[PDB]
């Protein structure tokens, strides 16, 4: 059912993971980055630098001109385009072909990365989110109403240069993870918004008000690399974070993801760095589980070396790749919530190991939300 679609994720560390899709009559084949941060499709249409092949409009027959014109920023890069629609089918997905809007980007800044070897994004999330407007319908959407695909898709995006992983479209696949599911609520159908209610590092709570941890939002986000955080809790898990490896120091550009830090082949010291969990609002009442990450995933590596993969935002909490690397993650649209279980690609160590934990009790979860 559901084998075909294993291991269809492709590529690079730190440059986001793509699947093969063909668009237009006659099919054109295009690396796709699988983004649930945004809610866009679109893929190069121009000649670029970066870019080893592009979506030549002029040779499909069944492209249309939706006449109107697009941009859109991310966190990191951002391009222009023209609105249209045309045919699209995932080759190691779905026996399906839809008639989706896509958006031929024919101007970017920083969007494109030399060596990458993908040439477009697919935006998974909802039409909220979605550029112009919330009537341009993403192409998940497209995708349910025209077939008979369920509303559901998991990502098991699996860790260490080249990175591999699964995109199960209209599913879940019970070989790819072992335990437990643990589920909790989209908070709202925009980003895949999620509400974080407690936060430990070592086994010691941050204390902080459960809002910082969600201050603005928190949202799941396959195209970022990082755990990006709030500002206040940033500082506050570095704090924590520089006290348990306090053994050591570390170039304080290190911390800010300036510079690396490099130890000798097999030396590294992982004991030294603390283990992070996050807890996560539940299906019932007073209810919370736990999902604990380990330093091998937010040390990213770049001798041994290393950047710090924790950083900053200014828009909220954003659980990236090395959160969702080592999960099997379920984004059960149909009932508005997120899966997470321990992955089949999962990362441990000797004496350590990510895990997905509950339930818990968590008391006033409804105050964390901001
Ligand atoms: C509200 C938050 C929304 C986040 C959301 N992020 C998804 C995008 C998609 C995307 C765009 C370009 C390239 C990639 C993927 C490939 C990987 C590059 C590494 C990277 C990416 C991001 C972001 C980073 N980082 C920060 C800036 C460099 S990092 C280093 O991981 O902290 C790195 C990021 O923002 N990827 C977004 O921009 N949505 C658009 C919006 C209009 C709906």
Same mark, same amino acid.
């Given at each position: 059912s559901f084998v075909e679609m294993v291991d269809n994720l492709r590529g690079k560390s730190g440059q986001g993971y793509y699947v093969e899709m063909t668009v237009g009559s006659p099919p054109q084949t295009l690396n796709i980055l699988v983004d649930t941060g945004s809610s866009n499709f679109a893929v190069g249409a121009a000649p670029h630098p970066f870019l080893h092949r592009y979506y030549q409009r002029?040779?499909? @027959? /069944? +492209?249309?001109?939706?006449? !109107? =014109? #697009? +941009?859109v920023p +991310?966190?990191?890069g951002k391009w222009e385009g023209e609105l =249209? /629609?045309?045919?699209?089918?995932?080759?190691?997905?779905? *026996?399906? /072909?839809?008639?989706? *809007?896509? $958006? %031929?980007? /024919?101007? @970017?800044? !920083?969007?494109?990365? *030399?060596? @990458? *070897?993908?040439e477009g994004i697919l935006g998974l999330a909802y039409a909220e989110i979605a550029r112009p407007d919330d009537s341009l319908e993403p192409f998940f959407d497209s995708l349910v109403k025209q077939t008979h695909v369920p509303n559901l898709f998991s990502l098991q995006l699996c860790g260490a240069a080249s990175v591999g992983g699964s995109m199960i479209?209209?599913?879940?696949?019970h070989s790819l993870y072992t335990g437990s599911l643990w589920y909790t609520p989209i908070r709202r159908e925009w980003y895949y918004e999620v509400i974080i209610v407690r936060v430990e590092i070592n086994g010691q709570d941050l204390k902080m008000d459960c809002k910082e941890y969600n201050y603005d939002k928190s949202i799941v986000d396959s195209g970022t690399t990082n755990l990006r955080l709030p500002k206040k809790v940033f500082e506050a898990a570095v704090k924590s974070i520089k006290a348990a490896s306090s053994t050591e120091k570390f170039p304080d550009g290190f911390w800010?993801?300036?510079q690396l830090v490099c130890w000798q082949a097999g030396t590294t010291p992982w004991n030294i760095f603390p283990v992070i969990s996050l807890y996560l609002m539940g299906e019932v009442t007073n209810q919370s589980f736990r999902i604990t990450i380990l330093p091998q995933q937010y040390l990213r590596p770049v001798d041994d070396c290393y950047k710090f993969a924790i950083s900053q935002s200014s828009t909220g909490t954003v659980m990236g790749a090395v959160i969702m690397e080592g999960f +099997?993650? #379920?984004?059960?649209? $149909?009932?508005?919530?997120?899966?997470?279980? #321990? @992955? %089949?690609?999962?990362?441990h160590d000797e004496f350590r190991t990510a895990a997905v934990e509950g339930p818990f009790v968590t008391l006033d979860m409804e105050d964390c939300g901001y």
């Amino acid at each position: 059912s559901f084998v075909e679609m294993v291991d269809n994720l492709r590529g690079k560390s730190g440059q986001g993971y793509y699947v093969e899709m063909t668009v237009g009559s006659p099919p054109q084949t295009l690396n796709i980055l699988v983004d649930t941060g945004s809610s866009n499709f679109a893929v190069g249409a121009a000649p670029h630098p970066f870019l080893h092949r592009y979506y030549q409009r002029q040779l499909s @027959s /069944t +492209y249309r001109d939706l006449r !109107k =014109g #697009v +941009y859109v920023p +991310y966190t990191q890069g951002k391009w222009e385009g023209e609105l =249209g /629609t045309d045919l699209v089918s995932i080759p190691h997905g779905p *026996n399906v /072909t839809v008639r989706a *809007n896509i $958006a %031929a980007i /024919t101007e @970017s800044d !920083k969007f494109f990365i *030399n060596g @990458s *070897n993908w040439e477009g994004i697919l935006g998974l999330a909802y039409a909220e989110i979605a550029r112009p407007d919330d009537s341009l319908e993403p192409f998940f959407d497209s995708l349910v109403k025209q077939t008979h695909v369920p509303n559901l898709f998991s990502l098991q995006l699996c860790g260490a240069a080249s990175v591999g992983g699964s995109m199960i479209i209209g599913g879940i696949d019970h070989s790819l993870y072992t335990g437990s599911l643990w589920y909790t609520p989209i908070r709202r159908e925009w980003y895949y918004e999620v509400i974080i209610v407690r936060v430990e590092i070592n086994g010691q709570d941050l204390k902080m008000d459960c809002k910082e941890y969600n201050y603005d939002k928190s949202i799941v986000d396959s195209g970022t690399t990082n755990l990006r955080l709030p500002k206040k809790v940033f500082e506050a898990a570095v704090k924590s974070i520089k006290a348990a490896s306090s053994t050591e120091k570390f170039p304080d550009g290190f911390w800010l993801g300036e510079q690396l830090v490099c130890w000798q082949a097999g030396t590294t010291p992982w004991n030294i760095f603390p283990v992070i969990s996050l807890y996560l609002m539940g299906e019932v009442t007073n209810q919370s589980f736990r999902i604990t990450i380990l330093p091998q995933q937010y040390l990213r590596p770049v001798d041994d070396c290393y950047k710090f993969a924790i950083s900053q935002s200014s828009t909220g909490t954003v659980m990236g790749a090395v959160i969702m690397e080592g999960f +099997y993650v #379920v984004f059960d649209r $149909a009932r508005k919530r997120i899966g997470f279980a #321990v @992955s %089949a690609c999962h990362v441990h160590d000797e004496f350590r190991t990510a895990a997905v934990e509950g339930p818990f009790v968590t008391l006033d979860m409804e105050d964390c939300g901001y």
